[PDB]
Amino acid sequence: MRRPTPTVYVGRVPIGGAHPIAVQSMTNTPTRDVEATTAQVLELHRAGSEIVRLTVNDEEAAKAVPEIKRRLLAEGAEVPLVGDFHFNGHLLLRKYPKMAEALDKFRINPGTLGRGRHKDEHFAEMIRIAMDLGKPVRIGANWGSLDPALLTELMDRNARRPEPKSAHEVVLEALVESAVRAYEAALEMGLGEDKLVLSAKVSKARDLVWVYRELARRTQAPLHLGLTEAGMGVKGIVASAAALAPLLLEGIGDTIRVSLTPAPGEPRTKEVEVAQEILQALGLRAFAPEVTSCPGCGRTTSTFFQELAEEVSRRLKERLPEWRARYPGVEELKVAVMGCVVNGPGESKHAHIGISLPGAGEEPKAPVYADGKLLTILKGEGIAEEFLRLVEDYVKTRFAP
Amino acid sequence: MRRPTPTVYVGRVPIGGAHPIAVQSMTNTPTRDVEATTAQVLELHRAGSEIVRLTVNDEEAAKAVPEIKRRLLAEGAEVPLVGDFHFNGHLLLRKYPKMAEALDKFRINPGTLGRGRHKDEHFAEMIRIAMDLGKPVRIGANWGSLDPALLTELMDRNARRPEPKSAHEVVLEALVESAVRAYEAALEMGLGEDKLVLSAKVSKARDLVWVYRELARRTQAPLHLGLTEAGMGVKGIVASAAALAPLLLEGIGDTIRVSLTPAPGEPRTKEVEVAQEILQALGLRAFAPEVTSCPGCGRTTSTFFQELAEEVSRRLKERLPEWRARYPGVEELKVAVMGCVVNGPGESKHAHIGISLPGAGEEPKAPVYADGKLLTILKGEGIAEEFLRLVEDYVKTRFAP
Ligand SMILES: C/C(=C\COP(=O)(O)OP(=O)(O)O)CO
Ligand SMILES: C/C(=C\COP(=O)(O)OP(=O)(O)O)CO
Ligand code: SF4
Ligand code: SF4
Structure with missing residues (x-):
């Protein structure tokens, strides 16, 4: 156009x-x-x-x-x-x-x-x-x-x-x-x-x-x-x-x-x-990685979800100077952070890599998707640090020179 | 459409x-x-x-x-x-x-x-x-x-x-x-x-x-x-x-x-x-009065202009509950706050009411326009309070029932 x-x-x-x-x-x-x-x-x-x-x-x-x-x-x-x-x-x-x-x-x-x-x-x-x-x-x-x-x-x-x-x-x-x-x-x-x-x-x-x-x-x-x-x-x-x-x-x-x-x-x-x-x-x-995240609703715990989304956004901003230098194309990175099973898996499959938290009524586990397919399932404390490590591993592979 | x-x-x-x-x-x-x-x-x-x-x-x-x-x-x-x-x-x-x-x-x-x-x-x-x-x-x-x-x-x-x-x-x-x-x-x-x-x-x-x-x-x-x-x-x-x-x-x-x-x-x-x-x-x-203001540049004093624009915006927000009750149509109010003579008068003439501060090289006076024509010229200390009074007077006349 x-x-x-x-x-x-x-x-x-x-x-x-x-x-x-x-x-x-x-x-x-x-x-x-x-x-x-x-x-x-x-x-x-x-x-x-x-x-x-x-x-x-x-x-x-x-x-x-x-x-x-x-x-x-x-x-x-x-x-x-x-x-x-x-x-x-x-x-x-x-x-x-x-x-x-x-x-x-x-x-x-x-x-x-x-x-x-x-x-x-x-x-x-x-x-x-x-x-x-x-x-x-x-x-x-x-x-x-x-x-x-x-x-x-x-x-x-x-x-x-x-x-x-x-x-x-x-x-x-x-x-x-x-x-x-x-x-x-x-x-x-x-x-x-x-x-x-x-x-x-x-x-x-x-x-x-x-x-x-x-x-x-x-x-x-x-x-x-x-x-x-x-x-x-x-x-x-x-x-x-x-x-x-x-x-x-x-x-x-x-x-x-x-x-x-x-x-x-x-x-x-x-x-x-x-x-x-x-x-x-x-x-x-494309200038920098971006985070797609839901608004959250009554299906998710508000604080935890909001905190995670913010944490992911902040870490991507912290890593970008280095990333820009090492990993051509990383500016195009799309990360998802989602509140529940309704749209979490689907949206995450549209990102390069994304996490779907468990919402109400769900077992306490968080699937992670990369390249449109299940990568792993996270549980327990330290979901955020585990996820961020997975994003780092993803970047190094996907945007390698 | x-x-x-x-x-x-x-x-x-x-x-x-x-x-x-x-x-x-x-x-x-x-x-x-x-x-x-x-x-x-x-x-x-x-x-x-x-x-x-x-x-x-x-x-x-x-x-x-x-x-x-x-x-x-x-x-x-x-x-x-x-x-x-x-x-x-x-x-x-x-x-x-x-x-x-x-x-x-x-x-x-x-x-x-x-x-x-x-x-x-x-x-x-x-x-x-x-x-x-x-x-x-x-x-x-x-x-x-x-x-x-x-x-x-x-x-x-x-x-x-x-x-x-x-x-x-x-x-x-x-x-x-x-x-x-x-x-x-x-x-x-x-x-x-x-x-x-x-x-x-x-x-x-x-x-x-x-x-x-x-x-x-x-x-x-x-x-x-x-x-x-x-x-x-x-x-x-x-x-x-x-x-x-x-x-x-x-x-x-x-x-x-x-x-x-x-x-x-x-x-x-x-x-x-x-x-x-x-x-x-x-x-x-239209939901509420809005403030059109320039970005400011090296032609204006940055703090003073930014402070005035912010003050006007805050006052309009403070007056709105009352205004909505007294003055039908006030939601459509457009106010301008401008940094210098380059675009200040012209933009102000497009607002219902607007102020053009003096920028570099100008005499220290601030024209005020309403309904596309000069209303007054302000100088000295208290420009902001004088202007806000003029906006109040304008509202009461223009949006009277
Ligand atoms: C709650 C929810 C999605 C997030 O809200 P949205 O308002 O973004 O989307 P939608 O609900 O589909 O109109 C369920 O599809
Ligand atoms: C500095 C100035 C206006 C405010 O900047 P803008 O970038 O809004 O507009 P313009 O300069 O006309 O491209 C002079 O017209
Ligand atoms: S993914 Fe779930 S928690 Fe997030 S807004 Fe959609 S329905 Fe609500
Ligand atoms: S009105 Fe004057 S001070 Fe404001 S951005 Fe335009 S040229 Fe600069």
Whole structure:
């Protein structure tokens, strides 16, 4: 189902229909703070952020970028950097060529280029710089910063229709048009199709789906997909997954970013985890072993089952660094931990390896299945440690080099 | 887009294409423990569980059900109860008619009815009881308990094809067929279309989408949609949202349950919250005011912004019980809290009411927008309390009776 697109290299990372969907994120430290920003780029990259964006908002930020890059490279960290430009990107790129060169990609927002005639000139200057330096660009529209002149143009087109659409629908048309027009203008200037990524983000899931279907149809470019301003906590996580899944399953989207608001003191790597979970849930990429477990019900003892499931999950997380190094393919491992005989054996047979605890009315023994067939039956104390040993033995055999 | 279906009443709650998608859940206490189970049904219902399921696994459980029901009614709690039957449902329903009568719905699993010839007789007996008592039934297939005789029949049909499908695909065909055959058999027995709900659950998102598309096509019934055995934590939440969204946006699904494994000590109401968030994220139902907020970046001061967003979210949660009582429609309230001028004003204008903090390079003032236009501009200490007062004033005006 994957939409074909040209490949756009962002540093060493290829983006497009022929490549895995790349996970990205954005820093939240002040870019002028070289120490804090370098540390957080490294943190995000180590969590799985294949590309990292940072705001390049003012001259102090611009002056910091080459140093951040130098420090990354000194540790052998090859993480591509995307500069986020608004209002003054043309001035910062012009004035600070070492910043322009140190970035791996420029983001432009067609709605933050300035007013009237100035918008076209500013756009052209940034595209010129990118062309001169061989850099890729994302043309990223966002409905929080929609070009007002385009909105009026589309509102007038709407008003001439025999059956005008709602104001909200016209906003979405304008957002798509903003990105498409800017894409076509960049191509016309001579920027290559191997240098252009597009996005057009809204904060409501159902709207996002509409928008990206239009962008996918109307353009050839790789698409950067995300639900902007998703918010805090569970709501942010749910909204992000809900918005992305329909599109991802239809084959639309080449890189994703999850726009979560961190709780105070929550690490900025949560968004990377959520991004990875979305792709893995959909069978698009595999990052780490996963545990399938039942909710538990009145058929099982709640504490014991919940404790075991949690213990298995924690052990897999502990073993992963080593495993990733020794056992190619282990990222695909599926482990089941189940509460009773109703679905326990069947679900366990669908995992690589799984355990079915005894629930109410059952003899106190726990079958273990691997590769769809009975492996052993556990009893007594120490079920969890025995099971984890069996998972280790399984991994070493199944994912051996 | 909503798929039309007959209405099935579960107690007082209507399920079907003409009705809101109902949120449901399942208890995890031992059903024999009347006190614990009654308490948890009440807890789940107060969190938003419009229907509550409990396992009816053995005779002690069956004997408890009428008492649970009596205690609910004594508090004026009209929450419909679904009994979850496996292996011995026909015996429990037969032997305990007061249990049969106290339930509002029976769940049958076509894969947990017994072996061979026994399966048909057991199925018929449960359907007979439901018919006698006027109860609705869910015929709920699950791939953890797939009828093995049907699987073999479909594996043989597959093997005759010019291009056989994979074993995994045949499992999914068998699961659909299990539910469809049982549905058709119940209808043929005389159970009404106003008494039959269907489900056919798997634990992988992309598979769920395939299954439910087939069930929706092949049947007329309302559908109970959920991703079974979704697991723990963020993974469970993401997988559930990812699996449900594509279907919900295509108009498929009449009731949902989110199958999360609670962490030890985590309340069983988390699944209800997640269910509600899925429906609200998709614009299908509204349960509570929501906060749209940016991720924050290097343009904003991280702590202050994150703290404000969290404070606003917490206050809305605190005010909701009162608000729900005074201000019809308040569940639809959208509040924005934004980090800087880039997207702050624009996003805030899309909310009912929103605040745009000042970010880097800006004067220290925070515009507030309501109904898409500037309401005021805040400065100094106490921005959060001033803003919350403005949100209160807004609510009282906008959602007045
Ligand atoms: C930093 C920012 C918005 C918040 O990030 P998002 O990643 O949500 O959206 P976008 O940047 O438009 O791709 C600027 O539009
Ligand atoms: C209790 C149980 C499974 C876990 O609940 P689920 O709600 O995940 O699945 P189902 O019951 O099949 O609707 C029995 O199949
Ligand atoms: S496997 Fe058993 S304990 Fe777990 S939710 Fe299913 S029926 Fe309940
Ligand atoms: S509104 Fe401003 S502070 Fe918030 S993420 Fe967007 S650009 Fe950064």
